[PDB]
């Protein structure tokens, strides 16, 4: 479909039974979700953002169904403001920026 940036670009995700809403972000190299209970072994990485660095938990091989398109990528769990579906998942779902 096409979205049409007059509204913030939100899509729904299904990540391990938890139905949460997430933003498609073109200027986010990674996807970070807040509030989800994610289960297993994790490698701790530190991410950057603007005036910010937060320790995310890097969990690999997590299936996330983004708006009814599936992608098995890497999701970071953290105290983020809005949930992000960044480039690492956007590529799998075939997302393109156009003008």
Ligand X SMILES: CC(C)[C@H](NC(=O)[C@H](Cc1ccccc1)C[C@H](O)[C@H](Cc1ccccc1)NC(=O)OC(C)(C)C)c1ncc[nH]1
Catalytic residues: 25
Residue 26 contacts which entry, ligand X, its own copies, none (Cβ below 5-8 A, type-dependent) = its own copies
Query: Counting contacts by CB under 8 A, is residue 70 touching its own copies?
Result: no
Query: Counting contacts by CB under 8 A, is residue 13 touching its own copies?
Result: no
| Min dist. Cβ of residue 99 to ligand X (A) | 19
Would strands 84-85 and 18-24 be described as parallel, antiparallel, or unpaired? parallel
Match 């075939």 to its residue by tokens: 94
Query: Counting contacts by CB under 8 A, is residue 53 touching its own copies?
Result: yes
Are 46 and 55 a contacting pair, CB within 8 Å? yes
Query: Counting contacts by CB under 8 A, is residue 44 touching its own copies?
Result: no
Tell me how far apart the alpha carbons of residues 7 and 3 are, in angstroms, rounded to a whole number. 8
Among 26, 60, 61, 63, the residue binding its own copies under the rule CB under 8 A is 26
Task: Summarize as ranges the residues that interact with ligand X (CB under 6 A).
Answer: 23, 27-30, 32, 45-50, 81-82, 86, 88
From the number of C-beta atoms within 10 Å of its C-beta (0-12, 13-18, 19+), residue 70 rates as exposed
């Amino acid at each position: 479909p096409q979205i049409t940036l007059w509204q913030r670009p939100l899509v729904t995700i299904k990540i391990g039974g938890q139905l949460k809403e997430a933003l498609l972000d073109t200027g986010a190299d990674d996807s970070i979700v807040a509030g989800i209970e994610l289960p297993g072994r994790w490698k701790p990485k530190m991410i950057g953002g603007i005036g910010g660095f937060i320790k995310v938990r890097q969990y690999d091989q997590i299936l996330i169904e983004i708006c009814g398109h599936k992608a098995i990528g890497t999701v970071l769990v953290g105290p983020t403001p809005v949930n992000i579906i960044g480039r690492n998942l956007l590529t799998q779902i075939g997302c393109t920026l156009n003008f």
